[PDB]
Design a protein around this ligand. Structure first.
Ligand code: NAP
Ligand code: FOL
Ligand code: MN
Ligand code: MN
Ligand code: MN
Length: 159
């Protein structure tokens, strides 16, 4: 099973200048809980944005060019990325925009954080078709002293 996990600001913005400009510790904690002990697939730009391997997860990087770091696994196509995960129950695709576009048709589950923040960005989450997806979990949180925007955790499963 393939799942996508992402945090979206208003208008599906996910990034600006290879960064995420907000800071929501509660959402990063949600990301860690839902990805720990699973393989994570990311594109090369997102690998450079994170800047280090994510501990406790098999890190798989998509790039058309040879890898430059043997602490992670480098693959050259979507099919190779999936195969490199082996026989696991759940593969987590962690972006970015181009990678989400390619894996969306193959995904059965979406873990989405909707952030009440207006961000100028240059990268968006794919338009998906709402009729294809059922919301099975949602949890709203107001802003607090640690998290400066309100946010909604949602899990959707392909109907
Ligand atoms: N809010 C969120 O949840 C979230 C999550 C992740 C990322 N982001 C943000 O998203 C932005 C990065 O997204 P992006 O769309 O620019 O880049 P990306 O999807 O992270 O990376 C694209 C790169 O991945 C490689 N790639 C993708 N598909 C491939 C394929 N089928 N075969 C081989 N290589 C492939 C290519 O690398 P080569 O050029 O080396 O061939 C391509 O240039 C940043 O702003 C980051 O902060 C946000
Ligand atoms: N919901 C969601 N939020 C995100 O921030 C996110 N980020 C990415 C890609 N970028 C990043 C950037 C930093 C870290 C990171 O530092 N993660 C630590 C945080 C642990 C914690 O804060 O409790 C980790 O171990 O996962 C992960 C992904 C992909 N999907 C996401 N999905
Ligand atoms: Mn092929
Ligand atoms: Mn197999
Ligand atoms: Mn806000």
């Amino acid at each position: 099973m393939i799942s996508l996990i992402a945090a979206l600001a208003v208008d599906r913005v996910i990034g600006m200048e290879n960064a995420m400009p907000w800071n929501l510790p509660a959402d990063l904690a949600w990301f860690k809980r839902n990805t720990l002990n699973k393989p994570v697939i990311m594109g090369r730009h997102t690998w450079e944005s994170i800047g280090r391997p994510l501990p406790g997860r098999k890190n798989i990087i998509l790039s058309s060019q040879p890898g430059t770091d043997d602490r992670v696994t480098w693959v050259k196509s979507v099919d190779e990325a999936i195969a490199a995960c082996g026989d696991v129950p759940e593969i987590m695709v962690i972006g970015g925009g181009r990678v989400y576009e390619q894996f969306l048709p193959k995904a059965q589950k979406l873990y989405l954080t909707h952030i009440d923040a207006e961000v100028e960005g240059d990268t968006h989450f794919p338009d998906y078709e709402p009729d294809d997806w059922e919301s099975v979990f949602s949890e709203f949180h107001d802003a607090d002293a640690q998290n400066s925007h309100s946010y909604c955790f949602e899990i959707l499963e392909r109907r």
